[PDB]
Amino acid sequence: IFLEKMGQKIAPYSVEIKNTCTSVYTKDRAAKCKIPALDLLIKLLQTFRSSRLMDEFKIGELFSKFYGELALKKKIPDTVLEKVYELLGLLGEVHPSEMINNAENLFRAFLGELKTQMTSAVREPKLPVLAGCLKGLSSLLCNFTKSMEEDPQTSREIFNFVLKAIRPQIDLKRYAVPSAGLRLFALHASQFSTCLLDNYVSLFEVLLKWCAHTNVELKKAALSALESFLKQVSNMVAKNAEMHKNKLQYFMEQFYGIIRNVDSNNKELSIAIRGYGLFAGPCKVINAKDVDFMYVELIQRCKQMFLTQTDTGDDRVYQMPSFLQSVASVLLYLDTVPEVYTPVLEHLVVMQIDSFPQY
Amino acid sequence: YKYSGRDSLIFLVDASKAMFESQSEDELTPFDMSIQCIQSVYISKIISSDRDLLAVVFYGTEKDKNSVNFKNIYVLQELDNPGAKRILELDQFKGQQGQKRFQDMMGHGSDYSLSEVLWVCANLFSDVQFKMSHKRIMLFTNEDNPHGNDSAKASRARTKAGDLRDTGIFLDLMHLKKPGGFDISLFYRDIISIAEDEDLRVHFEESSKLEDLLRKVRAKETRKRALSRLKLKLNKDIVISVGIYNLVQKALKPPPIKLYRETNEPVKTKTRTFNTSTGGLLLPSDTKRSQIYGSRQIILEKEETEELKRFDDPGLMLMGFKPLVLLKKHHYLRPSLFVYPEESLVIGSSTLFSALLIKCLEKEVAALCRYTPRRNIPPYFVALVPQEEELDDQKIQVTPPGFQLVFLPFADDKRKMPFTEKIMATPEQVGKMKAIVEKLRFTYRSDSFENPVLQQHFRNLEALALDLMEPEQAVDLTLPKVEAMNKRLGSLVDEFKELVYPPDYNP
Amino acid sequence: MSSFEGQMAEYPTISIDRFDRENLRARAYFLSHCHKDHMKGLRAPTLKRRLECSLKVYLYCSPVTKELLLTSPKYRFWKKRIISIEIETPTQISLVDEASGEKEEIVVTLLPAGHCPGSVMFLFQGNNGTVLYTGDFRLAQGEAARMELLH
Amino acid sequence: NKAAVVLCMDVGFTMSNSIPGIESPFEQAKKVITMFVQRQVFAENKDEIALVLFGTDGTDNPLSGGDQYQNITVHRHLMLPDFDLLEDIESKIQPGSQQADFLDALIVSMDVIQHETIGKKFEKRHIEIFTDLSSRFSKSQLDIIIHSLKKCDISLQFFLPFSLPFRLGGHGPSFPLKGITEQQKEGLEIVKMVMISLEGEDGLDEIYSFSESLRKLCVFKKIERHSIHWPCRLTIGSNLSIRIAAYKSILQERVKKTWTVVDAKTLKKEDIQKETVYCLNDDDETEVLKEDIIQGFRYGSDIVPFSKVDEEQMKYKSEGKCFSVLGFCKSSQVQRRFFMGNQVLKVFAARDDEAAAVALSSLIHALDDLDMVAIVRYAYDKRANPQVGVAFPHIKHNYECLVYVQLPFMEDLRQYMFSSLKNSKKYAPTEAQLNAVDALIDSMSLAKKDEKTDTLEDLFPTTKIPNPRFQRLFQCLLHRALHPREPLPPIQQHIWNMLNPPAEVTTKSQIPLSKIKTLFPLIEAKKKDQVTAQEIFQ
DNA sequence: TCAGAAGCAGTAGAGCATGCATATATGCATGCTCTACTGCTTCTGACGATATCG
DNA sequence: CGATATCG
Ligand SMILES: O=P(O)(O)O[C@H]1[C@H](OP(=O)(O)O)[C@H](OP(=O)(O)O)[C@H](OP(=O)(O)O)[C@@H](OP(=O)(O)O)[C@H]1OP(=O)(O)O
Ligand SMILES: [Mg+2]
Ligand SMILES: [Mg+2]
Structure with missing residues (x-):
């Protein structure tokens, strides 16, 4: 907690804190006195990633020690293995210079553990180990990237593991594994070039499903993953001419159905507007016969939701800014603005200004 | 009660003048006898149950060592697991010069208050950081009326003993040899919890329980714990929860511990597999399983060898019933387990269990089942032989009620017997053998034999821990004692030999 | 929630509404009401083991709190160790130590809280002055001047 | 052979x-x-x-x-x-x-x-x-x-x-x-x-x-090799003895070929090295050699160094190759529920001589007529630990032999106290439930009386079915050796059918099963089936 | 040949923490660690018979 | 029959 409070202020004591953490991890046996011993080291490494203190930490020796511990037939508890995998993944991110000779070895370890935990027909999975492996992979792929245009096998099996992680095949109660999978997908979606361009339908469906979840961190992770996926797919469909006839019309139909739907809160409308922008921007497929359509739709919905509906709008005020941002994003696109919808707009902005103290 | 509960025992030995000077014919002083008894209990408990708590407290001394600084009360050892060093510390006072060592270290012959002694005992009982199943204080003294010429201290001690007994502390009396005579009816009749109903008269010697405590019984005791909580499946719908218990388990010596010869401390063993050529470490995900048959080489993953040996889910699938008349006694494969209902996973299992037990007992039928103890385990066929409880020895349960899980061997477990001819014997020979068998018959008890190797290992460990160079040799109780069997049969052996053997024959 | 560590600075030998870590050495337990956030450690195995090894430690609370607590089967082991105290009745509590025969008297007064059945206040008076513990109370404006025992 | x-x-x-x-x-x-x-x-x-x-x-x-x-x-x-x-x-x-x-x-x-x-x-x-x-x-x-x-x-x-x-x-x-x-x-x-x-x-x-x-192992009946004889002497006193030969009649049959540990890339086992390293439990983790480690046991929270040579020279020495009868007792005071061992021995007579054969036959017949057993003291050789066991007569129409099963010692007995069920007033079943269980048992009978002589004839001879794990392993190895890249095939239908009772018993017990379901209430607390990882992330 | 010894994996039984929403109370459920015990698999070596040499 | 070295 103290390192979280004063991050960079602990300049001289970092080496001693790391030494004490390593000594507690080595000499002690209880996991309750061992999980914090690795959490503090992870916080140290995340706080001093760019600082020059990464030379006295001996990242190479630490990685060697933890890898030798991994190669032990004696099994450690599940909760500490998660932190071990997370730390091993972080070791490649904060100091990749000393990890060029070990990233290829660590990727095989991560892939084997993920396959053992997600392709086991004789034993139940271990969700903490899964979340740890996912976070370690998301932290290791930051520098030692593996794209489809570099090596297809690894970049495809990683994508399949991410799919199976974010796949709601069996609904659970803890969301650590799907949250880590969504964060991994959001961080490095630019590597799975041909992967996301084949199962894009199921990807979009599951991302829309997770973006409406009741959780907050899971919602943010799903939103970031959906934004990255939409950006990548829009780039791929706007760069070449063979992706238009299927993907362009599919995504345009999806966005139009999301927009013209009557039961769709501000989240889906904003997502549809952002996707339509990111797609029709570079693709140069904008047609005023539908931009004006979605503009009139948004204006009528805002009018029937905020202006005419003069009732107990407990949540409407807390979502009016998103409606205004979407309306502005749409209005900036079309060039022939209907003059009949200018009052509704001016009065709408006036009433939004009036609701300022309620925020 | 609880599985995690352990036992606690506090040795309370007096240190008055009568404890050191009672040698009528110079055989054993009451203090030396108490030290011998305490050492015997320590030795017998350090192997049987090494997780119990023992404490030795001396009262009536001159010095004092307490947590509340009471007077004339010295706590030598607190409630902890019995070790070898405490045995030596008690040995410091065992010998005759041990009495002088005691009187120079702690002193003797002083006044005391029996209330403060019980208070220190309760304080020691209240410092335990584990659950205690039984709390017992054995008082080693030779004072039939300790608080003489004073009634206030006697009433205070009686009130404190009542408080301790209300707390749940067993308080028995181990009276030693009193010269004039030890009568517990004076004072200790109202102190102890239960009276043995035979000490209405007076005693002139040691107590009858000291000889019981001096017999060092070395046998590791294990608490009751089910091997597995399976589910007897009378059908895909009718399922009841039963507990599998083992009543006969092979006793094994404790496994050794790798040590550092210099500091005599345990070392940490870390097995590790790596490539011999490159030198890089190998994880289980980077390893396959092979099995070479001739020229071929079958390659299988790690998790596939478990698929090879899995058929169904763990539990007891109920097959039909079979009479006991067709269950051969020579069809033994594994030691028989014990089935008993749990009434904790499913509600209503005990009633159906008792019904099945009664119906199988009155019909002497054995419910055949398919035994799968753990996940990914090949199934075995077992017959749930019904067992009726037997209440003997003034209503003491010697056999629990339930079913007897008996393993049945398969076709390949039975081996082939070579062909031989049945040569029989004459009625005279069979009658002679019957007579010589009736001459040597006896009564068998299941607990009449001991494992000689295990007992010898215990004796050797004691000799190496206590640093005594005279290791006790445990007499082999499994020997037939041929030096006494021939004296009973008499001259039947040579007659039977001449009857069934040729004139000249080399056996 | 209850951010209280069940230990007053003036009287550290008594713990209120908390029996988790350092309150296992207390000489007297007090329970304001029967809410779960004020009953941490009341069913702990360590406290269960301590109760069966002592005779002078008790749990003081309102009679309604005692009725609500003894009804639950998980807390029925306190049946012989709970001493209910009437409200607005100054009683003397003996903080006798178990190990040593030391003793200490303190005067406690239970005041109504108006929160839930059995909710009361604790007003202690001893050598270190007068302290007040209003655990989850509810008083309207102008009612503090109507408490007889606080005047 | x-x-x-x-x-x-x-x-x-x-x-x-x-x-x-x-x-x-x-x-x-x-x-x-x-x-x-x-x-x-x-x-x-x-x-x-x-x-x-x-x-x-x-x-x-x-x-x-x-x-x-x-x-x-x-x-x-x-x-x-x-x-x-x-x-x-x-x-x-x-x-x-x-x-x-x-x-x-x-x-x-x-x-x-x-x-x-x-x-x-x-x-x-x-x-x-x-x-x-x-x-x-x-x-x-x-x-x-x-x-x-x-x-x-x-x-x-x-x-x-x-x-x-x-x-x-x-x-x-x-x-x-x-x-x-x-x-x-x-x-x-x-x-x-x-x-x-x-x-x-x-x-x-x-x-x-x-x-x-397919479920009788009859094709291997005239090709299996006989067992190895254990020659010894069945002594009664210090002089009387009988030349006997003992064979293992029942023994846990396990696989003989282990699973070799090979590298994932190179299928050669020589590329794998299993190294064991000993180190102290310190911060620096100093490596320890192999010749500076002494064997030690645990004696009441303490550790007593007991070296291998000291354990050998102080080990319990016994005279190997001994088989002496300790005595005799009625067969009713020794139950089969106390048998503790892993193999059953049939004690036969000597190889060729007839005197030991006649003596052992007389012993068997005497033990049978008096329905008593012979507690013996068996030891395999100089190094095996001595053990006691039962030796009861086994008389058949073709041969005579003594069956030997090991008995438990004092340290092998455990006295677990269980609550009684006869006077269990909280779980005493009603008479209608007793009749329902009676109907179920009579419906699920696996024995029948035939030939008008009313002899027992079990419909499920489980003592003649081969171990299904061996057939499963064999078929899986065959499938993998003839199909190098394919998943393991499921269990064949005949193997899964030989591990089940005849369908007539199930059809006859259909109704008693529902009858038992009706009367007996069974409420399950919380069913959490352990689903594998493949079933969750297919 | 096979008994016995390591070495490893699974579970019972206790215990504990946290996650629960706009509640300040949840108690409630759920999921994890720990430890001693049992069992299976792999390995080893002494051993006794019986083969062979004198 | 010695008694030595296999071989399981
Ligand atoms: O009782 P059954 O079901 O009819 O089986 C028995 C049993 O066969 P198992 O060896 O497979 O158990 C006998 O063996 P034991 O039980 O006595 O060990 C065997 O005798 P052999 O082993 O000497 O061959 C022979 O008994 P019998 O010939 O007296 O009938 C045989 O009966 P079936 O082969 O005729 O079925
Ligand atoms: Mg509260
Ligand atoms: Mg409250």
């Missing part, structure tokens, strides 16, 4: 008839032969087998010259079985149009046995037959076959699609009602005659069905 055996399978058109609801007899014979050859291969026992296919389209036989022995093809000579024969049986065995006869097949099998076992030493020679008996044959060569079998000491077994719904190996009548033709009838008569004329009446019991042969 090798043993010759020639498999004679019929590949005629007769067995190729697709009966509705039942697999073809050709398929059942293929299953039986596959099980036989796979248990012969994976056991790695020195043996040579031969396969003679008769009733095929082609013709290949050493005596085929002269328009004799047509449609007889020796598909495999007397050689060690391997994966080639497995591939042959699995894939490239196809039915034939012409129907040959089993008599000329027996002739050519004798020919192979007597012209290929020349330079080899075989203590046993066997011939198995897989026919349908629905083909034409003659009656002339029967006496010649009988004489050649009695002079060459050849053992024979016959396997038919029928015994003397339908589930393959499901403990039920394999023969279809009224499905035996007159040709099959006369074939049955002649085969019963030829089996009786070989070794007596017991020869008729050497005729098994196809489904019957």
Whole structure:
């Protein structure tokens, strides 16, 4: 907690804190006195990633020690293995210079553990180990990237593991594994070039499903993953001419159905507007016969939701800014603005200004 | 009660003048006898149950060592697991010069208050950081009326003993040899919890329980714990929860511990597999399983060898019933387990269990089942032989009620017997053998034999821990004692030999 | 929630509404009401083991709190160790130590809280002055001047 | 101790008839032969087998010259079985149009046995037959076959699609009602005659069905090797003793070939090194050698160094090769629920002398008449730990022996106190529940009284079914060796059907099961089935 | 040949923490660690018979 | 029969 409070202020004591953490991890046996011993080291490494203190930490020796511990037939508890995998993944991110000779070895370890935990027909999975492996992979792929245009096998099996992680095949109660999978997908979606361009339908469906979840961190992770996926797919469909006839019309139909739907809160409308922008921007497929359509739709919905509906709008005020941002994003696109919808707009902005103290 | 509960025992030995000077014919002083008894209990408990708590407290001394600084009360050892060093510390006072060592270290012959002694005992009982199943204080003294010429201290001690007994502390009396005579009816009749109903008269010697405590019984005791909580499946719908218990388990010596010869401390063993050529470490995900048959080489993953040996889910699938008349006694494969209902996973299992037990007992039928103890385990066929409880020895349960899980061997477990001819014997020979068998018959008890190797290992460990160079040799109780069997049969052996053997024959 | 560590600075030998870590050495337990956030450690195995090894430690609370607590089967082991105290009745509590025969008297007064059945206040008076513990109370404006025992 | 055996399978058109609801007899014979050859291969026992296919389209036989022995093809000579024969049986065995006869097949099998076992030493020679008996044959060569079998000491077994719904190996009548033709009838008569004329009446019991042969281990009956004798002396006192030989009659049968640890990339085991390193529990983790470690035990929270040499010189020394009777007692005071061991010993007499035989027979009969047992003191050799056990008489119509089962010591007894159920007022069942359980038990009876003498005849002989784990391992190894990149196949239907009672018992117990369900209430607290990772992340 | 000894994996039984929403109370459920015990698999070595040499 | 070295 103290390192979280004063991050960079602990300049001289970092080496001693790391030494004490390593000594507690080595000499002690209880996991309750061992999980914090690795959490503090992870916080140290995340706080001093760019600082020059990464030379006295001996990242190479630490990685060697933890890898030798991994190669032990004696099994450690599940909760500490998660932190071990997370730390091993972080070791490649904060100091990749000393990890060029070990990233290829660590990727095989991560892939084997993920396959053992997600392709086991004789034993139940271990969700903490899964979340740890996912976070370690998301932290290791930051520098030692593996794209489809570099090596297809690894970049495809990683994508399949991410799919199976974010796949709601069996609904659970803890969301650590799907949250880590969504964060991994959001961080490095630019590597799975041909992967996301084949199962894009199921990807979009599951991302829309997770973006409406009741959780907050899971919602943010799903939103970031959906934004990255939409950006990548829009780039791929706007760069070449063979992706238009299927993907362009599919995504345009999806966005139009999301927009013209009557039961769709501000989240889906904003997502549809952002996707339509990111797609029709570079693709140069904008047609005023539908931009004006979605503009009139948004204006009528805002009018029937905020202006005419003069009732107990407990949540409407807390979502009016998103409606205004979407309306502005749409209005900036079309060039022939209907003059009949200018009052509704001016009065709408006036009433939004009036609701300022309620925020 | 609880599985995690352990036992606690506090040795309370007096240190008055009568404890050191009672040698009528110079055989054993009451203090030396108490030290011998305490050492015997320590030795017998350090192997049987090494997780119990023992404490030795001396009262009536001159010095004092307490947590509340009471007077004339010295706590030598607190409630902890019995070790070898405490045995030596008690040995410091065992010998005759041990009495002088005691009187120079702690002193003797002083006044005391029996209330403060019980208070220190309760304080020691209240410092335990584990659950205690039984709390017992054995008082080693030779004072039939300790608080003489004073009634206030006697009433205070009686009130404190009542408080301790209300707390749940067993308080028995181990009276030693009193010269004039030890009568517990004076004072200790109202102190102890239960009276043995035979000490209405007076005693002139040691107590009858000291000889019981001096017999060092070395046998590791294990608490009751089910091997597995399976589910007897009378059908895909009718399922009841039963507990599998083992009543006969092979006793094994404790496994050794790798040590550092210099500091005599345990070392940490870390097995590790790596490539011999490159030198890089190998994880289980980077390893396959092979099995070479001739020229071929079958390659299988790690998790596939478990698929090879899995058929169904763990539990007891109920097959039909079979009479006991067709269950051969020579069809033994594994030691028989014990089935008993749990009434904790499913509600209503005990009633159906008792019904099945009664119906199988009155019909002497054995419910055949398919035994799968753990996940990914090949199934075995077992017959749930019904067992009726037997209440003997003034209503003491010697056999629990339930079913007897008996393993049945398969076709390949039975081996082939070579062909031989049945040569029989004459009625005279069979009658002679019957007579010589009736001459040597006896009564068998299941607990009449001991494992000689295990007992010898215990004796050797004691000799190496206590640093005594005279290791006790445990007499082999499994020997037939041929030096006494021939004296009973008499001259039947040579007659039977001449009857069934040729004139000249080399056996 | 209850951010209280069940230990007053003036009287550290008594713990209120908390029996988790350092309150296992207390000489007297007090329970304001029967809410779960004020009953941490009341069913702990360590406290269960301590109760069966002592005779002078008790749990003081309102009679309604005692009725609500003894009804639950998980807390029925306190049946012989709970001493209910009437409200607005100054009683003397003996903080006798178990190990040593030391003793200490303190005067406690239970005041109504108006929160839930059995909710009361604790007003202690001893050598270190007068302290007040209003655990989850509810008083309207102008009612503090109507408490007889606080005047 | 090798043993010759020639498999004679019929590949005629007769067995190729697709009966509705039942697999073809050709398929059942293929299953039986596959099980036989796979248990012969994976056991790695020195043996040579031969396969003679008769009733095929082609013709290949050493005596085929002269328009004799047509449609007889020796598909495999007397050689060690391997994966080639497995591939042959699995894939490239196809039915034939012409129907040959089993008599000329027996002739050519004798020919192979007597012209290929020349330079080899075989203590046993066997011939198995897989026919349908629905083909034409003659009656002339029967006496010649009988004489050649009695002079060459050849053992024979016959396997038919029928015994003397339908589930393959499901403990039920394999023969279809009224499905035996007159040709099959006369074939049955002649085969019963030829089996009786070989070794007596017991020869008729050497005729098994196809489904019957899959869950009885009968094909390995005349080729298994006998046990190793343990020569010792059964002493009574200091002088009286009896020369005895003891064999292991029942023993836990486990696999003999372990699973080698090889590298993932290189399938060679030499590229794997298992190193064990010892280190102190310190911060620096100083490495410790191997010669500076002393063995030590634990003695009451302490550690006492007990070196190997000190443990050896102080170890309990006993006189090995001893078997002395401690005494005698009634068989009623020693129950089988206290048996503690892993193997059963049958104590037989000496090898050849008759005096020890008569003495042991007298001992057995005396122990039987007095219904008493003989507690003995058994020890395998100088190093084995001494043990006590029961030695009760086992009298049969063919042999005499003493069965030995080890007894537990004092440290092996555990006194667990369980609550009583007879006076369990919280769980005492009602009388209607007792009647329902009675009906269920009487419905689920696995024994029956037949032949009007009212003798017991169990419908589920679990003591004769082979271990299914061995067959599963064999079929999985075969599938992986013949299909290098494919998932493991599921459990075959006959294996999963031989581990179940006959369907008649289930059909009769359907109603009592629901009746038990009605009265007895069963409420489950929380069902959390352990689902594997594949079922969650498919 | 096979008994016995390591070495490893699974579970019972206790115990504890946290996650629960706009509640300040949840108590409630759920999921994890720990430890001693049992069982299976792999490995080893002494040993006794019986083969061979004198 | 010695008694030595295998071989399981
Ligand atoms: O082959 P079965 O006719 O079915 O009967 C056999 C046979 O006993 P019988 O010849 O007296 O009927 C076996 O005797 P052996 O061949 O082993 O000498 C006997 O063996 P056990 O005495 O050891 O029980 C046991 O067969 P198995 O060895 O498989 O148990 C038994 O079987 P049934 O009692 O079921 O008829
Ligand atoms: Mg509260
Ligand atoms: Mg409250």
